[PDB]
Amino acid sequence: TSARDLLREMARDKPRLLAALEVASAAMAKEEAAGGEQDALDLYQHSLGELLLLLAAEPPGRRRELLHTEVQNLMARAEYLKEQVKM
Amino acid sequence: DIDFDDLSRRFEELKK
Ligand SMILES: [Co+2]
């Protein structure tokens, strides 16, 4: 089980968090598709905004740690993609 | 400790 699968399972009781994670999942799928780069960036930006506030709202615990790790990774993926697009 | 200052800076930069 990946960290992401586990985060999703810990989020089973929190629809807003699941939904933001699904938008992030769509971003990553778009990054793999021909012509998908701008859609990926838009999905990354939107999900990240939501996830940052959800992270601020999260009480301390394993789910917060997983969410922080995922947010850092998503931000880095989006940053790298943005640089690739800028060329 | 989460560095929200770093994350908020990076987020504004990304958004453009
Ligand atoms: Co929204």
Residue numbers in the entry:
A (entry chain A): 12 to 98
B (entry chain E): 5 to 20
Q: What do the authors report?
A:
Here, we investigate the function of Unc-51-like kinase 3 (ULK3), a poorly characterized member of the ULK family of serine/threonine kinases that is predicted to contain tandem MIT domains. Furthermore, our biochemical and structural studies show that the ULK3 MIT domains bind tightly to IST1, an ESCRT-III subunit required for cytokinesis. Finally, we show that ULK3 phosphorylates IST1 and other ESCRT-III proteins and that IST1 phosphorylation provides an essential inhibitory signal in the abscission checkpoint, thereby ensuring proper coordination of the final events in cell division. MIT domains bind short motifs within the C-terminal tails of ESCRT-III proteins called MIMs (MIT-interacting motifs), which become exposed and concentrated when the ESCRT-III proteins polymerize.
ULK3 residues 372–446 form the characteristic MIT three-helix bundle, and the IST1 MIM1 helix binds parallel to MIT helix 3 in the groove between MIT helices 2 and 3. The N-terminus of the MIT domain (residues 360–373) forms a short helix that packs in the groove connecting MIT helices 1 and 3. This helix has not been seen in previous MIT domain structures and is expected to interfere sterically with the binding of canonical MIM2 (and MIM3) elements. The ULK3 M434 residue is central to this interface (red), which explains why the M434D mutation inhibits IST1 binding. The additional binding energy appears to be contributed by N-terminal IST1 MIM1 residues I350 and F352, and by the central F359 residue, all of which make hydrophobic interactions that are absent in other MIM1-MIT complexes. Binding of the bulky hydrophobic IST1 MIM1 F352 and F359 residues is accommodated by complementary small ULK3 MIT2 interfacial residues A415 and G408, respectively. Charged or polar residues are found in equivalent positions of other MIT domains such as VPS4A or ULK3 MIT1. These interactions likely explain why IST1 MIM1 binds tightly and specifically to the ULK3 MIT2 domain.
